[PDB]
Structure 1
Amino acid sequence: FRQENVDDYYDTGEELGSGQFAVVKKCREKSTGLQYAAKFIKKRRTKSSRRGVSREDIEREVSILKEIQHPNVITLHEVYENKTDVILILELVAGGELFDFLAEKESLTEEEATEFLKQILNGVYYLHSLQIAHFDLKPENIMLLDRNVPKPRIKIIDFGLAHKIDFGNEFKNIFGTPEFVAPEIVNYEPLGLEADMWSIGVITYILLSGASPFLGDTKQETLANVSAVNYEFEDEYFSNTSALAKDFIRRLLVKDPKKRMTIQDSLQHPWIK
């Protein structure tokens, strides 16, 4: 990573958002005048510390980002590091959240939505081809490059929990928002590409109905619902949803990961064609 001072080449600006471990600010590259999204990740000081992110976890997120290159995935521009932080100069998005964009339009044809879901599936497809499990697929991580265009492109913007599946030993923890994680995760079981697919199933469900399939009033209720895979298509929301759509969701939200559709099967699915 570049050991120089970010402030020497970029002019940080307004804060765009915060996370338990990071804070992304909008910056302007001095020599080009181009805008970027600088993500500040505070380093872990001690192995016993519960604060910050271990340089290994940072290493992992940087390598992944450095490897990927797809229209539906954020791109990494530069990486700076100082005494306390590791700054990732990331591509800057302007369209906002996908779900904020859709939730501003009138009715959204079941097909008009599939066009967006198709984009997501691609990005995931790309990632999975390189054997990369995103592990943090959720609305908040799905924005739009530009919202003032004929066919706005979606971008998977975060890669913190992203893991490269290596033959041999595996990981077990690494889980994100309860509302979107898969049962394998909750029960701390062997993880794979299946988790991402479960996530996709949840996205599509919310995408079409506007309701979460496992969102409890409290983190514990949710995890409980997820663990029990007790979702349902209540006629109050899924009354104007095709049979194929529900089938598509059913094949994704299944407890046994081996029986759960894969990114390829989902693209071959008749609801996507």
Structure 2
Amino acid sequence: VFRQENVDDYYDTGEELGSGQFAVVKKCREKSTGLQYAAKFIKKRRTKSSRRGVSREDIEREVSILKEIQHPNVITLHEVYENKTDVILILELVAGGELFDFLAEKESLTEEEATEFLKQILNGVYYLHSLQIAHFDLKPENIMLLDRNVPKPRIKIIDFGLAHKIDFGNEFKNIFGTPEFVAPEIVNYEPLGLEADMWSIGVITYILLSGASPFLGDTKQETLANVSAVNYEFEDEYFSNTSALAKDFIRRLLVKDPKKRMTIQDSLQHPWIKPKDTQQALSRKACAVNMEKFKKFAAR
């Protein structure tokens, strides 16, 4: 359950790291160990008729998922408190900022170097998917770095707000997420599973290489329609110096039919991620990220 004590008895809290919807995040320090965490205050709705907070079901689900996950590439949950108005998640402090903002600062980035970071996301998803957990909100802002000032920065996937344990024997259908990142089955209210994360990874990879967004249109409805139609191009302006292997990887991910979409286990075996001969390995070193445009992307 959730500790019914004053978190202020156990933590010192300070600067605001962020906020959104019905939550604020503060940096905090555990008094008994002196260790630093993130404290996330989530407003309870309190009455069902209220649209001014988060329902207990949703908090319960997220927390229950967070309780299970123990993997270097996903945030860890330390503790959970509850008071009259909030549930308070004490979360592993993830301070490296957004992966993309960190990549937007290099001068150059080989596909080989790109796959270094991308493989870290795959490993994180491999684990979640191995536990039957769909994240359902994979997008660039949810790919953080634990610490930016080390030679080999580690990726942490965060924000399990939309995540679900997949239930054999009960279809799950819903609309949610960010239009340019959601799979067609989310747009069309079709059944949802692990496969929807694989679509989103395709989108991320496409942006990582190009600085361009695959399905983004001039309006929400246009973006939704591009997605449902799988209407995307490898526009020559953006994919000039991008290998076939990289393009094959994305093509096997951006696939309307979930049953034909590449799986996490397969993507880890794909030649672009795991070169199976010397030609492919060199192709990876040779081609690069469209970094001029990519930087423009990180502009937001």
TM-score, with structure 2 as normaliser: 0.88
Q: Deviations over 1:122-147 (max 9, x none)?
A: 00000000000000111111111111
Offset at residue 48 of structure 1 (A): 3.0
Of stretches 102-111 and 47-56 in structure 1, the one that deviates more from structure 2 is 47-56
Distance 1:21 1:223 in 2: 26
Task: State the alpha-carbon separation in 2 of the partners of residues 48 and 199 from structure 1.
Answer: 33
Partners of 2:96 and 2:180 in 1: CA distance:
24
CA distance in 2, matches of 1:145, 1:237: 30
Q: Is the 8 A contact 2:73 2:124 kept in 1?
A: yes
The answer as to whether partners of 2:125 and 2:264 remain within 8 angstroms in 1 is yes
Distance in 2 separating the partners of 1:257 and 1:21: 32
Q: Decide whether aligned partners of structure 1 residues 21 and 172 sit closer, same or farther in structure 2, where only a CA change above 3 A counts.
A: farther
Q: Distance in 2 between matches of 1:217 and 1:52?
A: 31
Displacement after TM superposition at 1:213 (Å): 0.6
CA distance in 2, matches of 1:123, 1:62: 18
Structure 1 segments unaligned to the other structure (5+ residues):
none
Greater Cα shift, 44-53 or 56-65: 44-53
- Superposition deviation, residue 173 in structure 1: 1.2
Structure 1 Cα separation of the partners of residues 214 and 13 of structure 2: 39
Compute the displacement of 1:248 (Å).
Answer: 0.3
2: CA distance, partners of 1:214 / 1:12: 41
Superposed displacement of residue 17, structure 1: 1.2
Provide the C-alpha distance between the structure 1 equivalents of 2:123 and 2:236, rounded to a whole number of angstroms: 30
In 2, distance between residues paired with 1:189 and 1:51? Answer: 28
SS class of match (2:173): coil
8 A Cα contact 1:161 1:174, kept in partner: no
SS at 1:126 equivalent: helix
Which stretch of the first structure deviates more once superposed, 94-103 or 222-231? 222-231
Number of corresponding residues: 273
C-alpha distance in structure 1 between counterparts of 2:48 and 2:197, whole Å: 29
The 1-side partners of 2:158 and 2:53 are apart by 20
Deviation at 1:34, TM superposition (A): 1.5
Note the C-alpha offset of 1:233. 0.4
Cα offset, 1:18, TM superposition: 1.1
Does structure 1 conserve the Cα–Cα contact (< 8 Å) formed by 2:175 and 2:187?
Answer: no
Aligned residues of 2:175 and 2:189 also touching (Cα < 8 A): no
Cα displacement (A) at 1:46: 2.4
* Aligned-residue offset at 1:174: 5.3
SS of corresponding position for 1:112:
helix
Q: Give 3-state SS (helix, strand or coil) of 1:258's partner.
A: helix
Equivalence for 1:248? 249
Q: CA RMSD in A?
A: 2.2
Distance 2:246 2:28 in 1: 41
Q: Deviations over 1:216-246 (max 9, x none)?
A: 2332221121112111100111011100100
**Change beyond 3 A, Cα 1:174–1:17:** farther
CA deviation profile, 1:93-148 (whole Å, cap 9, x unmatched): 12110000000001110110001000000000000000000001111111111111
Aligned-partner SS, 1:152: coil
Deviation at residue 84 of structure 1 after TM alignment: 0.7
Q: CA deviation at 1:59?
A: 0.7
Asked whether the equivalents of residues 77 and 91 of structure 1 are also in contact (C-alpha less than 8 Å), the reply is yes
Deviations 1:33-57 (A, max 9, x none): 2111111111122223333111111
36-45 or 202-211, larger mean C-alpha shift: 36-45
* Percentage of identical aligned residues: 100
Q: Aligned equivalents of 1:104 and 1:176: distance in 2?
A: 28
Q: Within the alignment, does 1:162 sit opposite 2:173 as a pair?
A: no
Pairwise CA distance, 1:10? 1.1
1:175 CA drift (Å) = 2.3
Conservation of the 8 A alpha-carbon contact between 1:13 and 1:27: yes
TM-score (norm 1): 0.97
Matched, 1:120 2:126: no
Q: 2-side partners of 1:176 and 1:11: how far apart?
A: 33
Question: 1:49 aligns to what SS in structure 2?
Answer: coil
Structure of higher RCO (CA pairs closer than 8 Å, 6+ residues apart): 2
